[PDB]
Write a protein that binds this ligand. Structure first.
Ligand SMILES: *[C@@H]1O[C@H](CO)[C@@H](O[C@@H]2O[C@H](CO)[C@@H](O)[C@H](O)[C@H]2NC(C)=O)[C@H](O)[C@H]1NC(C)=O
Ligand SMILES: *[C@@H]1O[C@H](CO)[C@@H](O[C@@H]2O[C@H](CO)[C@@H](O)[C@H](O)[C@H]2NC(C)=O)[C@H](O)[C@H]1NC(C)=O
Ligand SMILES: *[C@@H]1O[C@H](CO)[C@@H](O[C@@H]2O[C@H](CO)[C@@H](O)[C@H](O)[C@H]2NC(C)=O)[C@H](O)[C@H]1NC(C)=O
Ligand SMILES: *[C@@H]1O[C@H](CO)[C@@H](O)[C@H](O)[C@H]1NC(C)=O
Ligand SMILES: *[C@@H]1O[C@H](CO)[C@@H](O)[C@H](O)[C@H]1NC(C)=O
Ligand SMILES: *[C@@H]1O[C@H](CO)[C@@H](O)[C@H](O)[C@H]1NC(C)=O
Ligand SMILES: *[C@@H]1O[C@H](CO)[C@@H](O)[C@H](O)[C@H]1NC(C)=O
Ligand code: NA
Lengths: 413, 381, 389
């Protein structure tokens, strides 16, 4: 029997950690030399599907051939490879799939797709990850969006800031991310005044001209509010922000403190879990999401002798490439599309007794006005260069509402 | 104590809606004082950023920021900024606040149709609210504000059934060309829903609006009731708190905090802050009357944020805490098949000059998501 | 005495039903012959009242000029009392007057013809995706709404298991691309352009107009939701009812019991007893007919008096209806961003129109395709149970 106590209001507390990731993982102007043969092959696949009437590198195509499954004839289903109308079928009985072979093109499986716009994205991501897994990280970070050009302005209340106050990490899905107030080296900045005037003010530059065409579709900027010593999982808990608007974000710290171990299966420190944490290089606190990615990466190395690119890699292991482990495409597919292994890891991982959420309300408005667009863009371009349009500049106003916390504490009674 | 969560199925009174525009109206009284301020800013941009379109605190590059000092010019410190956008905005704001306190203390005598030019249509629960009593006040950072369904209005808006059809429907005008481009750098409008008696804190619970989209705002009412005295330290009045309530409203957490900070602003710096109400005798701040008030205000925030003034300990929490969660659903309001007659209708009635580049006018819908709002009440055990 | 107990669970939870629906009910080129005289009479009101430079319709409810204020009045048979509606805005008066006749012209059209004239599952949907496996139009159940045409729910189909998500994130959830043909929008009926969805259970009736959230037709909308369940004691403590067994009101929605469903069913039942016709905005009770000025000329004032007595609690619906004990809720977190970038638009639109080739002959525009992401940010299922003490 535990007692539940609710207390909402306003109090002085530390400002949430603001993680800033760009939509595209890398700049196309600095990575086109690495994705030259892939993009040249992707344009050929588009021409084969869109306008068939109107050299290539088949070493990339033979890794995962995008085939067409024409099964509208129940007595004769056929599978045709893309590489007197010569159009490609798009009727109700036809479909497009990816042929994933395991051992010498014998144990080949099909990842079926109904629309071509989805199969082309999944095929390009699988081929791009194959190239991004065989390049060192020290070289893979410099070919992404730097913090000097993204963060054009930073003003937390009355104290200014710049790209040097943002901790730079490399999220393998969104490239270089920047955390405003993390708290690993210096103490977290508290805020005791609600309102946009006392909150965080940011002016970000989203360069859409350097986006990867076949990899990054959305032209926004990812934002996440998390704790001070927690790893930012952008794909799970992450919001967007339109380009050319002022996104006001009112934060509300909604906490829930569980009773303890003898009353609920929750951990405090996080060292009681059996699986080892692969995020130990960041010195962050325990997180349930970090345990779900450490088990999957451990199961990934267990089946095939390689680790995925979208997850941390232990010391001594190697990422999944095509020149070393050609079976990683079938290996990763059998582990991603498997609800059985997902349920096993959830049972092994435990939750934290003190969880924290941020019930944030998003309100946007067109920031660059017709009267202020002249001098604003002239100042920002003068500081960056010595290139900016409505699609580039992003305005963010993060702050606390009238009530900034809502704690639900459980007490033994 | 013991927490008891329940749902109240009663006639939901519609909260007061504060509608503010995003362009501060420059008064003709301070037109000569503002044109001089713009000339100093245009000269500042041309000297620093070469942008071609005597004040006590000039903006200079050292970063870019203005110097703040005390009376005897002993503890001088520079308030620097990273970019010129934030530097010019805050520097213009500081001088705009000082010259805004020089306005006369008399009531306006020139009745101008300032509401009809902003609100193109009002309709609550299939009933027009164009001819309704409201309260007008000019926010420094934002524009003119209009609060509807206030305590002073006898006709209280009652929401019978939840949904968009039985809620507030507004159509505001987002002026693309602001009166002050050096300070107003955002187009749209703000809407804040608060209690019938509670004041309007546009910085705390403001909700921006994009020009040219229909924003259906769903309100979820959340209230918390707790006992006071021996069970808790909450207060159901302002007599228990020694802080004098400066707002003409009931007791609230932020109302007492703003009042407690304003008293410390008057005792130390000698002048009252503009963004907060003032008593009948103390006047607002101005660099001509008070030689140095920005330095005293900056150092006051340092002591206030460190809980040195004691405003967080003196201001207790109210026993009745009501909140409104806002969830919006956006959609482009001008349809390509209706821009012909809709934009032409506004040009005939409201004389709205249609602009093919940007939309301008924006529609807003406010309503309750659920009729049974959650009520959290505590009970002894 | 009761005691609340808030406990969270982390496991594979079920995915709710997403009632995707376009705000434009029917293509204007399809229902032009039904609304031909209504469109002509509407434009004549613009040139007369506002002075523009320039199933049958009833001329009994015209637009008049009351003392620059325009509107219309709804009188009774004896013409003793008239329920008038005044308007201060021009666009607001036309949309309300057009919708008044639109609800009466479409009420005398057979249901089978209305479903055929609205959008299909393959025309409204361009791309379906959920938890890796790609879905199609067969995975959506038809749901005809009188205002939004045909709505399609992702889950909630008969003789099929409920889809459940086991990995949180925007990629392992619902990822649909909607086709919103803005060129065939009704000029006077609907003002904005876009789609709207409703997050509900498989046994809950989706209220599109009440608790529906609109979606912009030009950009992507990511909706992160958290499941929050609540349970309350029924008989001795809160007097709440479960499964709708204690209340004698018949449920005409054919779904689970709710307070809004009980009030609407009670108002519909009281309406058929008062006047011979039933309201068109709500589903039709058994052995009844919809309302229209052609067959029921005195229903505009009949509904006015009933609604006037329903708010004042005089019909007897708020006292008999009781709140439901248990119910779920999804705290939606909406986030918008430009879906087609300047560079990806060159290859997305030509491919997105290749999938929808039979329904669309030209190239899809950026303002016609709306992408939607609905998923669980976390698998934390917060349950609030009230145990007796
Ligand atoms: C992808 O689709 C193909 C074809 O629709 C599936 O393959 C078939 O499997 C069924 C039953 O196992 C057989 O009756 C067919 O003869 C097979 N056809 C071919 C061409 O192999 C395949 O199982 C699907 N894969 C997934 C993961 O859904
Ligand atoms: C951004 O970082 C700079 C330094 O990297 C901070 O400047 C320091 O601020 C502290 C206040 O705690 C002073 O004690 C130091 O003297 C300052 N150092 C320098 C070099 O000026 C700045 O405060 C940070 N701003 C934010 C918003 O975090
Ligand atoms: C959409 O419906 C189809 C069938 O109506 C689903 O396809 C089945 O998928 C399961 C996998 O969970 C297979 O075991 C069955 O053999 C399939 N049957 C058929 C007839 O194809 C499909 O999974 C549904 N889509 C989603 C996203 O759930
Ligand atoms: C095809 O690409 C691979 C790596 O992407 C490269 O090693 C190979 O040389 C390329 N083929 C040709 C013919 O250039
Ligand atoms: C959660 O609250 C408990 C209660 O005091 C505290 O001991 C614990 O440190 C908190 N968790 C974190 C991560 O600070
Ligand atoms: C200047 O004034 C401050 C406060 O007003 C005081 O602390 C300081 O001693 C003064 N300095 C001199 C030299 O008078
Ligand atoms: C609370 O204050 C009001 C006026 O502010 C006063 O009329 C009332 O008597 C007070 N009640 C208590 C219990 O102090
Ligand atoms: Na503005």
């Amino acid at each position: 029997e535990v007692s539940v106590s609710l207390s909402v209001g306003f109090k002085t507390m530390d400002f949430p950690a603001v993680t800033i990731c760009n939509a595209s993982p890398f700049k196309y102007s600095k990575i086109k030399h690495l994705l030259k043969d892939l993009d040249e092959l992707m344009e050929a696949v588009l021409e084969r599907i869109l306008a068939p009437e109107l050299n290539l590198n088949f070493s990339i195509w033979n890794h995962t051939p995008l085939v067409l499954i024409d099964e509208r004839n129940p007595h004769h289903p056929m599978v045709l490879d893309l590489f007197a109308s010569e159009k490609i079928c798009n009727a109700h009985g036809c479909k497009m799939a990816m042929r994933l072979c395991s051992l010498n093109r014998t144990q080949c499986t099909f990842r079926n797709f109904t629309s071509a716009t989805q199969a082309l994205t999944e095929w390009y991501i699988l081929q791009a990850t194959n190239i991004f897994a065989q390049v060192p990280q020290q070289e893979l970070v410099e070919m992404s969006y730097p913090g000097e050009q993204m963060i054009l302005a930073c003003l937390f209340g009355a104290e200014p800031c710049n790209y040097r106050n943002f901790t730079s990490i490399f999220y393998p899905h969104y490239g270089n991310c920047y955390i405003f107030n993390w708290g690993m080296t210096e103490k977290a900045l508290p805020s005791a005044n609600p309102g946009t005037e006392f909150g965080l003010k940011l002016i970000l530059d989203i360069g859409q001209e350097d986006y990867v065409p076949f990899l990054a579709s959305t032209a926004g900027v990812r934002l996440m509010l998390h704790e001070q010593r927690s790893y930012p999982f952008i794909r799970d808990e992450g919001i967007y922000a339109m380009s050319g608007t002022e996104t006001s974000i009112g934060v509300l710290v909604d906490k829930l403190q569980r009773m303890g171990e003898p009353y609920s299966p929750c951990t405090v420190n996080g060292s009681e879990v059996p699986v080892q944490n692969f995020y130990s290089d960041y010195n962050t606190t325990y997180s349930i999401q970090a345990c779900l990615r450490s088990c999957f990466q451990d199961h990934m190395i267990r089946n095939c002798n390689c680790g995925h690119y979208l997850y941390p890699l232990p010391r001594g292991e190697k990422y999944c490439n095509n020149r070393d482990f050609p079976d990683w495409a079938h290996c990763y597919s059998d582990l991603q599309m498997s609800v059985a292994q997902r349920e096993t890891c959830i049972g092994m991982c435990k939750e934290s007794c003190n969880d924290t959420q941020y019930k944030m309300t998003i309100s946007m408005a067109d920031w660059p006005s017709e009267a202020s667009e002249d001098w604003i863009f002239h100042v920002l371009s003068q500081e960056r260069d010595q290139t900016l349009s409505r699609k580039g500049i992003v305005k963010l106003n993060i702050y606390f509402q009238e009530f900034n916390y809502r704690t639900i504490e459980e007490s033994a009674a | 104590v013991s927490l008891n969560i329940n749902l109240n199925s009663d006639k939901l009174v519609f909260p007061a809606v504060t509608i503010c525009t995003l362009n501060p109206y420059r008064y003709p009284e301070i037109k000569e004082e503002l044109e001089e301020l713009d000339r100093i800013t245009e000269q500042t941009l041309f000297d620093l950023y070469k942008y071609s379109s005597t004040l006590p605190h000039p903006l200079q590059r050292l970063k870019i920021g203005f110097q703040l000092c005390n009376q005897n010019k002993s503890d001088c410190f520079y308030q620097t900024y990273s970019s010129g956008v934030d530097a010019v905005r805050e520097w213009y704001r500081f001088h705009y606040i000082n010259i805004l306190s020089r306005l006369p203390e008399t009531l306006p005598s020139l009745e101008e149709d300032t509401l009809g030019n902003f609100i193109f249509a009002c309709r609550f629960n299939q009933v027009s609210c164009n001819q309704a009593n409201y309260s007008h006040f000019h926010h420094p950072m934002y524009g003119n504000c209009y609060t509807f369904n206030d305590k002073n209005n006898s006709n209280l808006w009652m929401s019978s059934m939840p949904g968009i059809n039985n809620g507030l429907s507004l159509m505001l005008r987002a002026e693309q060309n602001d009166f002050i481009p050096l300070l107003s750098t955002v187009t749209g409008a703000r809407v804040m829903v608060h209690g019938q008696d509670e004041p309007a804190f546009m910085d705390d619970g403001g909700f921006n609006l994009r020009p040219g989209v229909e924003t259906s705002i769903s309100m979820r009412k959340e209230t918390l009731d707790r006992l006071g005295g021996d069970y808790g330290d909450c207060t159901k009045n302002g007599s228990d708190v020694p802080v004098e309530n400066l707002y003409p409203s009931k007791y609230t957490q932020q109302v007492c905090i703003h009042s407690c900070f304003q008293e410390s602003m008057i005792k130390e710096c000698g002048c009252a802050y503009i963004f907060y109400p003032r008593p009948q005798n103390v006047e607002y701040c101005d660099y001509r009357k008070h030689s140095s008030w920005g330095y005293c205000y900056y150092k006051l925030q340092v002591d206030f944020s460190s809980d040195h003034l004691g405003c967080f300990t003196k201001c207790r929490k109210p026993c009745s805490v009501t909140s409104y969660q806002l969830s919006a659903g956006y959609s482009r309001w001008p349809s390509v098949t209706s821009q012909e007659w809709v934009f032409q209708m506004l040009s005939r009635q409201n004389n709205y000059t249609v602009n093919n580049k940007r939309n301008g006018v924006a529609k807003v819908n406010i309503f309750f998501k659920e009729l049974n709002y959650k009520t959290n009440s505590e009970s002894p055990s | 005495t009761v005691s609340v107990s808030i406990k969270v669970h982390f496991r594979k939870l079920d995915f709710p039903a997403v009632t995707i629906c376009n705000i434009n009910p029917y293509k204007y080129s399809t229902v032009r012959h039904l609304l031909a005289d209504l469109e002509q009479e509407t434009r004549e009101a613009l040139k007369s009242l506002y002075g523009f430079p320039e199933p049958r319709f009833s001329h009994r409810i015209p637009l008049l000029i009351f003392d620059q204020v325009v509107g219309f009045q709804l009188c009774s048979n004896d013409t003793s009392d008239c329920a008038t509606y005044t308007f201060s805005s021009g666009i607001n008066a036309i949309q309300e007057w057009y919708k008044l006749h639109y609800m009466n012209i479409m009420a005398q059209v057979p249901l089978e013809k209305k479903i055929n004239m609205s959008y299909s599952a393959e025309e409204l949907l361009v791309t379906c995706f959920f938890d890796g496996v790609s879905c199609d139009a067969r995975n959506f159940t038809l749901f005809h709404h009188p205002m939004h045409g045909n709505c399609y729910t992702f889950n909630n189909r008969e003789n099929e298991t409920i889809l459940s998500t086991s990995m949180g994130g925007s990629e392992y959830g619902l990822q649909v691309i909607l086709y919103i043909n803005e060129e065939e929008y009704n000029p006077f009926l609907v003002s904005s352009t876009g789609a709207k969805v409703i997050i509900h259970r498989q046994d809950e009736y989706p209220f599109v107009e009440d608790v529906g959230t609109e979606i912009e037709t030009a950009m992507v909308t990511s909706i992160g939701m958290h499941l929050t369940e609540s349970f309350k004691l029924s008989e001795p403590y809160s007097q709440c009812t479960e499964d709708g067994s204690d209340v004698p009101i018949r449920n005409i929605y054919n779904a689970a019991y709710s307070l809004q469903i009980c009030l609407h069913s009670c108002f519909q039942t009281k309406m058929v007893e008062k006047c011979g016709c039933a309201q068109y905005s709500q589903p039709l009770p058994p052995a009844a007919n919809y309302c229209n000025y052609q067959q029921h000329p005195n229903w505009m004032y009949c509904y006015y008096q009933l609604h006037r007595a329903f708010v004042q609690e005089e019909l007897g619906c708020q006292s008999v209806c009781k709140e439901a004990c248990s119910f779920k809720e999804w705290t939606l977190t909406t986030s918008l961003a430009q879906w087609p970038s300047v560079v990806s638009e060159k290859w997305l639109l030509p491919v997105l129109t290749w999938d929808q080739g039979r329904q669309v002959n030209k190239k899809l525009n950026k303002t016609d395709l709306a992408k939607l992401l609905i998923f669980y940010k976390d698998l934390n299922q917060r349950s609030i149970m009230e145990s007796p003490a």
